Amino acid sequence: RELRLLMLGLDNAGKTTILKKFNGEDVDTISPTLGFNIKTLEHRGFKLNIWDVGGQKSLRSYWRNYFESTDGLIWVVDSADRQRMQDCQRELQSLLVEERLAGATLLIFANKQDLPGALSCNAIQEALELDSIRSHHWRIQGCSAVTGEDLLPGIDWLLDDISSR
């Protein structure tokens, strides 16, 4: 069957760039998403429906309207935005206790690793309290959406974990 991947995260985390970069499309004319961006494609034999939903404050209240039937959750973090790292943590943990997202595999993309002040994966692992997560399989993957570095390693793991369920 097709797999539904929901990609969320605070605004500016780089969700849209990751999606376009992943599909070999130009990522220089990317603007804020004021709704959703959905890509239906095939990767490694899997048919995927990837939902990149806008993360502006005003849009997060609608995130829950897209939880139903989500197989995988992709949480994108701006590794260099230490400021909103606390809000990022709260939003994520809020998602992890949602009933309509139970069992969904969690992929954390610590994005913008190409930036100078980018926190390490261990730092983000701690700042987001991932070790306490136990209702979901999860993996943190550092990456750069602009260069495209390490995007596949993250996605590929996510698909392998979901399929094993």
Partner: protein, 142 residues
């Protein structure tokens, strides 16, 4: 009735901003139509490089706006050659945010003189069973 009045608000607030065709392999846009794709008195058409007929992978993207919130939104896209079906896509969006702009894209896997001018891409958008908008684009290769 209130129901009819609400559906008129839905239709009036919907707009298909643009649609494009990309060579999936390279991610390069082969053709993108913008300006009033759902405006009356106009047979919308598209002049796309015929080489697209050689692509094993084509992606088609749509960008639409909705002033009104919708609960069971979906699209039906069929590509015809006269009466025969070349392609048919369906997609359930479900919830659509008020005053939102959204994008949808699918990775799609005869000569050219016979096709050109005879190929139509018909996109229909529904909110459950309310027809929100219909779009027809006749294709011309090169």
């Amino acid at each position: 009735s209130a129901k009819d009045e609400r559906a008129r608000e839905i239709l009036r607030g919907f707009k298909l901003n643009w649609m494009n065709l990309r060579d999936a392999e390279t991610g390069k846009i082969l053709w993108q139509g913008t300006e009033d794709l759902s405006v009356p008195g106009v047979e919308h058409e598209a002049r796309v490089p015929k080489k697209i007929l050689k692509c094993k992978a084509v992606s088609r993207e749509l960008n639409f706006s909705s002033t009104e919130q919708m609960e069971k939104f979906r699209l039906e896209q069929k590509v015809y050659f006269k009466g025969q079906c070349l392609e048919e896509w369906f997609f359930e969006f479900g919830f659509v945010i008020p005053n939102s702009t959204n994008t949808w894209q699918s990775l799609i896997e005869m000569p050219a003189s016979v096709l050109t001018g005879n190929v139509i891409i018909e996109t229909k958008f529904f909110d459950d069973d309310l027809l929100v908008s219909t779009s027809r684009v006749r294709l011309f290769y090169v």
